[PDB]
Structure formats: structure tokens, C-alpha cells
Design a protein around this ligand. Structure first.
Ligand SMILES: Nc1ncc(C[C@H](C[SeH])C(=O)O)cc1Cl
Ligand SMILES: C[As](C)(=O)[O-]
Ligand SMILES: [Zn+2]
Ligand SMILES: [Zn+2]
Ligand SMILES: [Zn+2]
Ligand SMILES: [Zn+2]
Ligand SMILES: [Zn+2]
Ligand SMILES: [Zn+2]
Length: 304
């Protein structure tokens, strides 16, 4: 049984991607952008009413297997789109004028593993030459100062950068999709947990994006909007100085392709539950996070 207020296993999420598409054909289509190491289809939902030459926002969840609130959020975003389209002026305007690509779970193999074997798994489940240690950090696997800081060369480490940038099937598939849709994708949003932050480039070096001032102000206003609901306190800024320097992240990579609005969201909490955020917090976390995402979306829409 699928529920938006619980964590759902991969079989349930996959079935939900079919059913939500099936039930909302005027707003949702579903493709597979490739397959995982283990051969699972990486589903992608395109959310929006058809129209000509529509710009797009790309959002993924579930890079990191254990960050279950991420996967729940992408699902929540789709829930909102389908529930409030027609009733709420903003979301209606967004879906009429933009398309949202929502990739509910990037690292499916890892996610399955968190359900069957090890709740605290992070990485992919691919093999590494010369060791039995499994997996690559997908957010250290992009071609963005690849493997240079805040990433490990050791395949047994949690931030393992992999054998080469885009060595993972999942990261290759994501990058290929973005590269193939670059002239329409105006913003890239990647959802993680935890520590309550809105981060923007760069993380791979202590350097700042050309539109730093604009990103800073947007991130600040998004954090302010998020707090209006439950008072939840986020920090924000360039990744390297706001969370830690880390190379090979998808947001930095996306920004270096020319996607000017590129953010990583690190959802609740600040460590009390960490990755094991209880189900009772799914609704409040997603709701407040909707406010930030809708704020960013509205900004993007108003500054094309
Ligand atoms: N470019 C980036 N932008 C954000 C992050 C933070 C996440 C939080 Se889980 C991570 O460590 O991958 C990491 C990188 Cl490498
Ligand atoms: C606090 As963390 C390991 O999710 O960046
Ligand atoms: Zn209004
Ligand atoms: Zn993460
Ligand atoms: Zn995190
Ligand atoms: Zn970054
Ligand atoms: Zn709501
Ligand atoms: Zn303005």
C-alpha cells in the first residue's frame, strides 16, 4: 500500500510512479532514463500540462540511499502537483508554464539495500576492482573537480568518488538526461538529508558562481519562506563554506553546464534522528520544503 505519509519501499514507489502517471495523464508522463547497476529502471516523471517550448525545472531525490526523507519529498511534490492543480493559483501557473522533471529515486539499488539489509547504506551497490567493498558515492561521481576534495579514493569509504566521473550507471544516466535537455532545463534541484540547508555552487573548490549574489538572495528568501510554516531554521550558501568542500557533486556539475539555478536541499533534521527521521515528521518536513521549492520555482518563472 503506498502512502505519502510513510516511507515506501522501492516496489511500492515503482508501482506508484506507474499509477500516478496512469491516473494523471494530462499532467504526468513517465520515462526510464536508464538502468541501475542491478538493472532497475530509473524512472523519471515529467510533471506539467503540455504546451509549446516550455522551460523546465529538474528535481531528483534519493541520491543517497539512507536519506529516506528525500525520496518521500519527491513523492510529496508530485502529490501536491496533482492535488492542487486548478485550485491553487501558483502551482497551477507553474505546471501550465513549466515542466517539472521529478526523479523520485536515483540510487534505487542502494535504496532497496537500506530496506533489505542495511538501513544506513549511502552509496550505489556497484562493484569495485580489487576489493570486496561495494559502491560509489553518486554525489562524488560527477565531472566537477572530480575526486579532488571531500571525496575519497578508497572504494571502501562512504565518499568514494568511483573509478572515473560518471562511472556509475545511475550518474551517467542522469548526466546524459540533463545534457540532452540542457536548452530547456533552467534549474536543477537535488534533495538530500540531513542538516537543514539550501546550498548552491561551489562545493568542489572555494570559488563562487558568477551569479553568486542572485543565488545568495534567492536561497535566503527560500529559507525565510520555509520557516514561515513551522519555524524550521535552515542555513544557506555556497556548499564549500556552508556544509563542507566536496567534489564531484551533481549541483556543481549542473551549474557548470550552464544551469544557473542549481541547489542542494538538505532536509530535516539537525541530527536528533538524522537519517532515521521518523515517519511522523514526513508531512511537516515536506510541507515546509514545498514552500521553498515553490519559492525557487516562482523566482525561476519570473526571471526567464
Ligand atoms: N556538490 C555538492 N553539493 C552538495 C553536497 C552535500 C551532500 C549532503 Se548528503 C553530500 O555530501 O553529497 C555535496 C556536494 Cl559534493
Ligand atoms: C549531516 As550529512 C552526513 O547528511 O551532510
Ligand atoms: Zn498568492
Ligand atoms: Zn545526501
Ligand atoms: Zn546529507
Ligand atoms: Zn555544491
Ligand atoms: Zn500541502
Ligand atoms: Zn526580481
Amino acid at each position: 500500500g503506498h502512502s505519502y505519509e510513510k516511507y515506501n519501499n522501492w516496489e511500492t514507489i515503482e508501482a506508484w510512479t506507474k499509477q500516478v502517471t496512469s491516473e494523471n495523464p494530462d499532467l504526468i508522463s513517465r520515462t526510464a532514463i536508464g538502468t541501475t547497476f542491478l538493472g532497475n529502471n530509473i524512472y523519471l516523471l515529467k510533471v506539467g500540462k503540455p504546451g509549446p517550448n516550455k522551460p523546465a525545472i529538474f528535481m531528483d531525490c534519493g541520491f543517497h540511499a539512507r536519506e529516506w526523507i528525500s525520496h518521500a519529498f519527491c513523492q510529496w511534490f508530485v502529490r501536491e502537483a496533482v492535488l492542487t492543480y486548478g485550485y491553487e493559483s501558483h502551482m497551477t501557473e507553474f505546471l501550465n508554464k513549466l515542466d517539472f522533471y521529478v526523479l523520485p529515486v536515483l540510487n534505487i539499488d542502494g535504496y532497496i539495500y537500506t530496506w533489505t539489509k542495511n538501513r544506513m547504506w549511502r552509496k550505489t551497490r556497484s562493484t569495485n576492482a580489487g576489493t570486496t567493498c561495494i559502491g560509489t558515492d553518486p554525489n562524488r561521481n560527477f565531472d566537477a573537480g572530480w575526486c579532488t576534495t571531500g571525496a575519497s579514493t578508497d572504494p571502501c569509504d562512504e565518499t568514494y568518488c568511483g573509478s572515473a566521473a560518471e562511472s556509475e550507471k545511475e550518474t551517467k544516466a542522469l548526466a546524459d538526461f540533463i545534457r540532452n535537455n540542457l536548452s530547456s532545463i533552467k534549474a536543477y534541484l537535488t534533495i538530500h538529508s540531513y542538516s537543514q540547508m539550501i546550498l548552491y555552487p561551489y562545493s568542489y573548490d572555494y570559488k563562487l558562481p558568477e551569479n553568486n549574489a542572485e543565488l545568495n538572495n534567492l536561497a535566503k528568501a527560500a529559507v525565510k519562506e520555509l520557516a514561515t510554516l513551522y519555524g524550521t531554521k535552515y542555513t544557506y550558501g555556497p556548499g564549500a563554506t556552508t556544509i563542507y568542500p566536496a567534489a564531484g557533486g551533481s549541483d556543481d556539475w549542473a551549474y557548470d553546464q550552464g544551469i544557473k539555478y542549481s541547489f542542494t536541499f538538505e532536509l530535516r533534521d539537525k541530527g536528533r534522528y538524522g537519517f532515521i527521521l521518523p515517519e511522523s515528521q514526513i508531512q511537516a518536513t515536506c510541507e515546509e520544503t514545498m514552500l521553498a521549492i515553490k519559492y525557487v520555482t516562482n523566482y525561476v518563472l519570473g526571471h526567464l
